[PDB]
Amino acid sequence: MTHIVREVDRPGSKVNKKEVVEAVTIVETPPMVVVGIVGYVETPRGLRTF
């Protein structure tokens, strides 16, 4: 986690056109690799792997 400083664009609020701090979370997201495909069929009992 870390925090940032940004401008606020919420009209009618006390922080409008002001500077605030906000805690943010950094989540590493490397690109995925697709290896398979599953299709589902809609049974009266619900869903099952076709």
């Binding site: 925090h3 400083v5 500077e19 701090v21």
Partner: protein, 62 residues
């Protein structure tokens, strides 16, 4: 991006860091951490604390 502050130690305080203190007489102080703040509340001269900027420039260290 905001106003960039200076502390008891003379260090630069970034936004979201430390605290701000306003005495009864109207003077306003800001501290980078508790250690810089505790020294100020103990009424200690920053020119006698070796890691304080004020001490460094007093003795022209570096």
């Amino acid at each position: 991006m905001k106003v960039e502050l200076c502390s008891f130690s003379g260090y630069k305080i970034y936004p979201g860091h430390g605290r701000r203190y306003a005495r009864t007489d109207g003077k306003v102080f800001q501290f980078l951490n508790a250690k810089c703040e505790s020294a100020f509340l103990s009424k200690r001269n920053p020119r006698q604390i070796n890691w304080t900027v004020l001490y460094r420039r007093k003795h022209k260290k570096g």
